[PDB]
C-alpha cells in the first residue's frame, strides 16, 4: 500500500519523511534521517525567530494581538508548504537515483524492474544506489 | 520488489488555521500561550491525512 498522494503513514512514527519497502526479505517503514533533521533545524529556527519579535491601552494591546495572529498564519502557511516542498524533493531524490531500473507507479510509489534486496534498498535510501549494477537486469525485464 | 516514498501521519487532533485553509489537522503543533487570541497554534508537524 501507497504512499503519500493518497495519504499519511500511521505505521511510521520515527520520521516526518521516509521510505517504505517490500521485498523477498520483508516489508517495512523507515525514516529519512537527513531530510527530517534539516526540517527540524528549519522549523525550530523560525519558531525561535517568531517568539523573539514578541515581548488607549486595552485598545492598542488589541492591535498587537492582531500582529501575532497574522504572523502565525504566515508561518503556518510557510510551514506546511515547506513540508510539501520537502516530500517532493525526496521522491525525486529517489526518482533521480533509480531511472529506468524501476517504475514510477504514480501516487508516490516505485516498483522495481530488478530484484531489490535489503542492501540495494539501503543504497537507494542513502544516495549511493548503483544504477549500472542492476541496469542490465532492469532493461530485459521491462520487455 | 517495491519501495515507497511517504510522509508521517498519526492520530493528532490538533488543528491550526493557515492563510489558505482553516482547521487543517496536523501531526504536532505548539501553543504559544506561555508568555489572548485564545488560539495561537503554530504548526511544526505536517498535515495529518491517515491511510
Amino acid at each position, epitope marked *: 500500500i501507497a504512499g503519500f498522494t493518497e495519504g499519511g503513514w500511521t505505521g511510521m512514527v520515527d520520521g516526518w519523511y521516509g521510505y517504505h519497502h517490500q521485498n523477498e526479505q520483508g516489508s517495512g517503514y523507515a525514516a529519512d534521517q537527513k531530510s527530517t533533521q534539516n526540517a*527540524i533545524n528549519g522549523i525550530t529556527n523560525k519558531v525561535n525567530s517568531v517568539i523573539e519579535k514578541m515581548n488607549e491601552e486595552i485598545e492598542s494591546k488589541q492591535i498587537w494581538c492582531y500582529n501575532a495572529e497574522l504572523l502565525v498564519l504566515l508561518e503556518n502557511e510557510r510551514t506546511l508548504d515547506f513540508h510539501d516542498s520537502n516530500v517532493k524533493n525526496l521522491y525525486e531524490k529517489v526518482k533521480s537515483q533509480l531511472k529506468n531500473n524501476a517504475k514510477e507507479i504514480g501516487n508516490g510509489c516505485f516498483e522495481f524492474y530488478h530484484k531489490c534486496n535489503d542492501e540495494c534498498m539501503e543504497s537507494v535510501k542513502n544516495g549511493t544506489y548503483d544504477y549500472p549494477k542492476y541496469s542490465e537486469e532492469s532493461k530485459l525485464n521491462r520487455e | 520488489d517495491t519501495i515507497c516514498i511517504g510522509y508521517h501521519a498519526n492520530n493528532s487532533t490538533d488543528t491550526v488555521d493557515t492563510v489558505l485553509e482553516k482547521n487543517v489537522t496536523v501531526t504536532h503543533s505548539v501553543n504559544l500561550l506561555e508568555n489572548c487570541s485564545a488560539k495561537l497554534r503554530m504548526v*511544526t508537524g505536517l498535515r495529518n491525512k491517515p491511510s
Partner: antibody
Framework: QVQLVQSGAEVKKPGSSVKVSCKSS????????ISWVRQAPGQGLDWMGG????????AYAQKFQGRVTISADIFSNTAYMELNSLTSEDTAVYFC??????????????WGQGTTVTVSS | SALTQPPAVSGTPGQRVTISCSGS????????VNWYQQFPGTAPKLLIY???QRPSVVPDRFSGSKSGTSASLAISGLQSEDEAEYYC???????????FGGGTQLTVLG
C-alpha cells in the same frame, strides 16, 4: 557551545514523586532528542525515556511506563523528568543527555552533570 | 540486561585490548551501536556511535566494530588514563527502548 544544567540533588520519602529539570544553557536543544538515563549506585545505565520537543515525541521505556511523566518546554530549553510512586529502589543518579539528532538512534554527545536522588523512609 | 558485557578486563600499558557486547537480533542485529566511557562519580561520555564512527576529539586508538548480534570495541596502545567503566548501547526493536550492557571495568595496571 551548548550546556545541560540539571536541578540540584533531591531526597524524598518513598511513594512521593520527584521532578528533575534540565536546562539547555548557551543555546537551544529543541531541535534535538533528549533522554533521561539513570544510574543506580555502582550499576549499569538504564534508559527511562526521552523527549524531542519540535519533532513532537514523548517516549517511554516499557518498564518505566505509567510511572514516569516526561515533559518539555521549548521556550526555556528545559526538559523534565518526573518519577512517581518512588521507592528505595528508585534511589540513583539521574542523567539527561542530548543526542546527535532529533531521534534516539543517534549517539548522545552532551550530558548534564546528573542529579542524584535518594529514597529512604 | 539486554546487552551482555564482561564484568572486567585488564591490560598492561601499550597493549591492545578488546571489549565484547553480545545481543540478540532485536537490538544489535537491526540497530546501530554506541559506546560510552565513564570515569567514576562523573557523567558518561560518548565514545563510538553508529558502530564504527568516532568523534573528532577521541584518540584514534579507539575503534569499533559490529558483527551479527555482537560488537567489539578496540583500544590499541592502552594508557593509564583509559581506566574506566565502559558501556555498550543500542536501540532495541522489541522493547522500543535503548538498552545497556551491565558495564565493563577496564583496569590499567601500571
Amino acid at each position: 557551545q551548548v550546556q545541560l544544567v540539571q536541578s540540584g540533588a533531591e531526597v524524598k520519602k518513598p511513594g512521593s514523586s520527584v521532578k528533575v529539570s534540565c536546562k539547555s544553557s548557551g543555546g537551544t536543544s529543541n531541535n534535538y532528542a533528549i533522554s533521561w538515563v539513570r544510574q543506580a549506585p555502582g550499576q549499569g545505565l538504564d534508559w527511562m525515556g526521552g523527549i524531542s520537543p519540535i519533532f513532537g515525541s514523548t517516549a517511554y521505556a516499557q518498564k518505566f511506563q505509567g510511572r514516569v511523566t516526561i515533559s518539555a518546554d521549548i521556550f526555556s530549553n528545559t526538559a523534565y523528568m518526573e518519577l512517581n510512586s518512588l521507592t528505595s529502589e528508585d534511589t540513583a543518579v539521574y542523567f539527561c543527555a542530548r543526542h546527535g539528532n532529533y531521534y534516539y538512534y543517534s549517539g548522545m554527545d552532551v550530558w548534564g552533570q546528573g542529579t542524584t536522588v535518594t529514597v529512604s523512609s | 540486561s539486554a546487552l551482555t558485557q564482561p564484568p572486567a578486563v585488564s591490560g598492561t600499558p601499550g597493549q591492545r585490548v578488546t571489549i565484547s557486547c553480545s545481543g540478540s537480533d532485536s537490538n544489535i542485529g537491526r540497530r546501530s551501536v554506541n559506546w560510552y566511557q565513564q570515569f567514576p562519580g562523573t557523567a558518561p561520555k560518548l565514545l563510538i556511535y553508529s558502530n564504527d564512527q568516532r568523534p573528532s576529539v577521541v584518540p584514534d586508538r579507539f575503534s569499533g566494530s559490529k558483527s551479527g548480534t555482537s560488537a567489539s570495541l578496540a583500544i590499541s596502545g592502552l594508557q593509564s588514563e583509559d581506566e574506566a567503566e565502559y558501556y555498550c548501547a543500542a536501540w532495541d526493536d522489541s522493547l522500543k527502548g535503548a538498552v545497556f550492557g551491565g558495564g565493563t571495568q577496564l583496569t590499567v595496571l601500571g
